[PDB]
């Protein structure tokens, strides 16, 4: 149940409860909830403080579920740039594809997150193709997202 409580507090965005669990009860940030997930996997990605608190206490950033999804994929897809920056700062790989063949940059392109695409562009392998055979520049272009094309052409 420590893993369920920490996951639950993180998913609700309760920063004070997350601090209490980590710093007073001394729950390890990788404690598993009942469905085998860590708090970093199910957190409210808008709560940057929760991500950094977990990472400073030793959470593993590269955790991945069986669909190949890690916290960086979900942070990029949902547009939470401040949280993505803390994840990358603490060692999260942004070049690992999910089970759809998508990097975090492909997900941000699909959803139209311009600031995230800009951040990830000089960091990502832009020749990687997803299941549909598209590179991130080709996915932009298909969608007609000219601001994303403009950014990606600058990186190749």
Curated annotation (Swiss-Prot):
Keywords: Acetylation, ANK repeat, Cell cycle, Cytoplasm, Nucleus, Repeat, Tumor suppressor. GO terms for biological process: autophagic cell death; DNA synthesis involved in DNA repair; negative regulation of cell growth; negative regulation of cell population proliferation; negative regulation of G1/S transition of mitotic cell cycle; negative regulation of intrinsic apoptotic signaling pathway in response to DNA damage; regulation of G1/S transition of mitotic cell cycle; response to retinoic acid. It is found in: Nucleus; Cytoplasm. One of its GO terms (molecular function) is cyclin-dependent protein serine/threonine kinase inhibitor activity. InterPro entries: Ank_Repeat/CDKN_Inhibitor, Ankyrin_rpt, Ankyrin_rpt-contain_sf. It holds the Pfam family Ank_2. ANK repeats lie at residues 35-63, 67-96, 100-129, 132-156. GO terms for cellular component: cyclin D2-CDK4 complex; cytoplasm; cytosol; nucleoplasm; nucleus. The keyword Transcription regulation does not apply. Interacts with CDK6. Interacts strongly with CDK4 and CDK6 and inhibits them. Belongs to the CDKN2 cyclin-dependent kinase inhibitor family. This is Cyclin-dependent kinase 4 inhibitor D. It comes from Homo sapiens (Human). The gene is CDKN2D.
């Amino acid at each position: 149940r420590a893993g369920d409580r920490l996951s639950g507090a993180a998913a609700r965005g309760d920063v004070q409860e997350v601090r209490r669990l980590l710093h007073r009860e001394l729950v390890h940030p990788d404690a598993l909830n009942r469905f085998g997930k860590t708090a970093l996997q199910v957190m409210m990605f808008g709560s940057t403080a929760i991500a950094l608190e977990l990472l400073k206490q030793g959470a593993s950033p590269n955790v991945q579920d069986t669909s190949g999804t890690s916290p960086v994929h979900d942070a990029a897809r949902t547009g939470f740039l401040d949280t993505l920056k803390v994840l990358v700062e603490h060692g999260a790989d942004v070049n690992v594809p999910d089970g759809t063949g998508a990097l975090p940059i492909h997900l941000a392109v699909q959803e139209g997150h311009t600031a995230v695409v800009s951040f990830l562009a000089a960091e990502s392998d832009l020749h990687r193709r997803d299941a549909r055979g598209l590179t991130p520049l080709e996915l932009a272009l298909q969608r007609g997202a000219q601001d994303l094309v403009d950014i990606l052409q600058g990186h190749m």
